[PDB]
Enzyme design. Structure first.
Site, PDB file in Angstrom:
ATOM      1  N   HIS B  78       0.765  -1.012   0.001  1.00 21.23           N
ATOM      2  CA  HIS B  78       0.061  -0.278  -0.057  1.00 21.23           C
ATOM      3  C   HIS B  78       0.802   1.236   0.191  1.00 21.23           C
ATOM      4  O   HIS B  78       1.855   1.285   0.695  1.00 21.23           O
ATOM      5  CB  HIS B  78      -1.030  -0.136   1.322  1.00 21.23           C
ATOM      6  CG  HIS B  78      -2.283  -0.862   1.196  1.00 21.23           C
ATOM      7  ND1 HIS B  78      -3.130  -0.610   0.027  1.00 21.23           N
ATOM      8  CD2 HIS B  78      -2.791  -1.790   1.742  1.00 21.23           C
ATOM      9  CE1 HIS B  78      -4.028  -1.633  -0.016  1.00 21.23           C
ATOM     10  NE2 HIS B  78      -3.723  -2.344   1.389  1.00 21.23           N
ATOM     11  N   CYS B 127       0.402   2.024  -5.379  1.00 14.72           N
ATOM     12  CA  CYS B 127      -0.536   3.201  -6.003  1.00 14.72           C
ATOM     13  C   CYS B 127      -0.042   4.540  -5.787  1.00 14.72           C
ATOM     14  O   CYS B 127       0.879   4.843  -4.605  1.00 14.72           O
ATOM     15  CB  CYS B 127      -1.887   2.826  -5.551  1.00 14.72           C
ATOM     16  SG  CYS B 127      -2.769   1.302  -6.214  1.00 14.72           S
TER      17      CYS B 127
END
Ligand SMILES: FC(F)(F)c1nccc(N[C@H]2CC[C@@H](Nc3ccc4nnc(Cl)n4n3)CC2)n1
Lengths: 346, 367
Positions: B78, B127
């Site tokens: 993440h 991301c």
């Protein structure tokens, strides 16, 4: 790879009102214009633009852009970098300046992506330190994944920036038939090899296609008829006119293009005066025996010489007097070069 | 060009306690470890690190860099990008997370330079969307012109990174990593390969940021011949020690082979096999229990019929067959020696033997 078209906007800001003046943009913009014109790019070369002018030049550049078109922005002048965003400082910017006084490169990029360009190239020849007076926080509007974006920065983040160093190295490599990212990476290596060590190129790239500034332009589209008629009206140079006076004296009035907004007037046997007030033609800078004295890039081997460097400020027709020491004669030369497009209309 | 050493730190975060779980970092970190080892890199591959663990591992990795050393940092997990700055999310991170909970890449960068490095490569497989909860914007001192930093982002700013299968970035990167090309030229060609793929179009595109002013590749030979380098070579030698396979003889005549396999620097597979079953004993089962509490092992991810079941990257064919598998990730949490029990139930008759296998893999270094 084929290009729908190849368009370039080159802005060189030197004559800052409330900030230090620059010198390199003059040599670097003229020389990059010549290199890009050799690569069949439709080049718009502009010097010393205010905020209002830079925004009108950007909009005029975008009307020349379409789907699969190659877009190139080159800026040399004062600049800064805040929160990832590059800002270009206009010549009328106050001291201190904020985001609203300047043009954000990412905002231009977004407008170029909305025109569905095949390639977006940004060659930013400016310093990349922060502006501690810019309180603004970027309204993070996620850009589209077009995978055709290439940034060529003259220097690394938080670092400083005859040709300027970036153009000195770029000139020797720009004409090579190589993918723009591979070519810029080679330019970065050239700088690394050079003893004269402190400055370094930074390349940002999302380009996924083997696109090069050398790529050929595809056959004419049959709105494209609008784009090319707008272009053919961009670089119109006045026709050399012979003048007749009541005493029998004959003077040849000649014109030459230096930039899209810079034209040289030269009289051969006789001085020029009463130019439009928007043009800001200081009579102390007009009628020089040499073109170098006028502030031109053009040397003598390229009578009396006058440089009109602010053609973008011309709202009406170029009408002025040709005085012969006592007689006077008015001349109407229309809207020369970039004055012919009403950029002010934006 | 020449490298004084080639060092790499690989972090793969998946099992987050307060965020959706990931899958691709397992296969991508494993596969990148192999390729990087094949390029004569000393690699440290760590799965599921906490803020404390991640900060520590990165602090030490910065130290390892000396003049002319090639350092590669790879993160899969993440992540987010707020106002130019990129952040890596640890597995223990709260909901919502802020910069003070995460590790900033623009910080790590500054500390690589202060070690006079030869090449700095950052491969960020995450991301790059903004975190609306981060009401703090760090402003770091002027990036030092070292002209040897290469950033390879899986995706573009404000966009997402998409996926025993590889993530889109590793799928393309693994095919080219071993090529004898300048790291910028190599990353650019992977961007072109990503571009040819039907799935990626308008969704994912690799972004390269480089200031490399020299012909440096991950294929560059190691040269340099230092006392300090020998200490790192000594420390790295200790780092990947696997316990030797042992045979345990029980009271009933049943002999059990206890075997070990390294999955990551912090992940070990333990397997039990009945090597001798006296004709008399027909049905027998051996199982491992009473593991150190530091490790935090799910007993429902221990003593499994297949290695795949334990959450391993390793398949049934990657290890000895007809055994029982126990996966021990979290070896970076083991403070004392690895002591556990080996139980044996046979037709029910139970017996046990205590086993001590020292400090395996990363646990051999005190952290
Ligand atoms: F596990 C954590 F919790 F994350 C943790 N906690 C604390 C520290 C830590 N340090 C990590 C793991 C050991 C590594 N030691 C070497 C030594 C020489 C050498 N030479 N080449 C290479 Cl590569 N190395 N690596 C350094 C990074 N990790």
């Amino acid at each position: 790879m084929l290009a729908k078209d190849k368009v370039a906007l080159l802005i060189g800001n030197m004559n800052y009102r409330e900030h230090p003046k620059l010198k390199a943009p003059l040599v670097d913009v003229y020389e990059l214009t010549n290199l890009l014109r050799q690569l069949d790019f439709k080049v718009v070369s502009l010097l010393d633009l205010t905020e209002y002018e830079m925004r009108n030049a950007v909009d005029e550049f975008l009307l020349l852009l379409d789907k699969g078109v190659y877009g190139l922005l080159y800026y040399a002048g004062h600049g800064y970098e805040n929160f990832g965003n590059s800002f270009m400082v206009p010549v009328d910017a106050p001291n201190p300046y904020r985001s609203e006084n300047c043009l954000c490169v990412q905002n231009i990029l977004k407008l170029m992506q909305e025109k569905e360009t095949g390639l977006n190239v940004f060659l930013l020849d400016m310093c990349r330190k922060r502006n501690d007076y810019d309180d603004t926080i970027p309204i993070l509007d996620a850009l589209k994944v077009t995978a055709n974006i290439v940034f060529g920065y003259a220097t690394c983040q938080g670092a400083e920036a005859a040709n300027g160093i970036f153009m000195k190295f770029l000139k020797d490599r720009l004409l090579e038939d190589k993918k723009i990212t591979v070519l810029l990476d080679e330019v970065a290596e050239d700088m690394g090899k050079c003893h004269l060590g402190k400055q370094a190129l930074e390349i940002r790239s999302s380009l996924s296609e083997k696109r090069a500034l050398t790529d050929p332009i595809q056959g004419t589209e049959y709105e494209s008829l609008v784009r090319n008629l707008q272009w053919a009206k961009a670089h119109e140079l006045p026709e050399s006119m012979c003048l007749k006076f009541k005493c029998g004296v004959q003077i040849q009035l000649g014109f030459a293009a230096e930039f899209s907004n810079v034209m040289i007037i030269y009289t051969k046997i006789a001085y020029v005066t009463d130019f439009p007030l928007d043009l800001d033609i200081d009579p102390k800078d007009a009628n020089k025996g040499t073109p170098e004295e006028t502030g031109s890039y053009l040397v003598s081997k390229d009578c009396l010489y006058t440089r009109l460097s602010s053609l973008q400020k011309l709202k009406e027709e170029l009408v002025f007097t040709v005085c012969l020491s006592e007689d006077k004669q008015e001349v109407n030369v229309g809207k020369p070069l970039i004055a012919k497009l009403d950029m002010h209309r934006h």
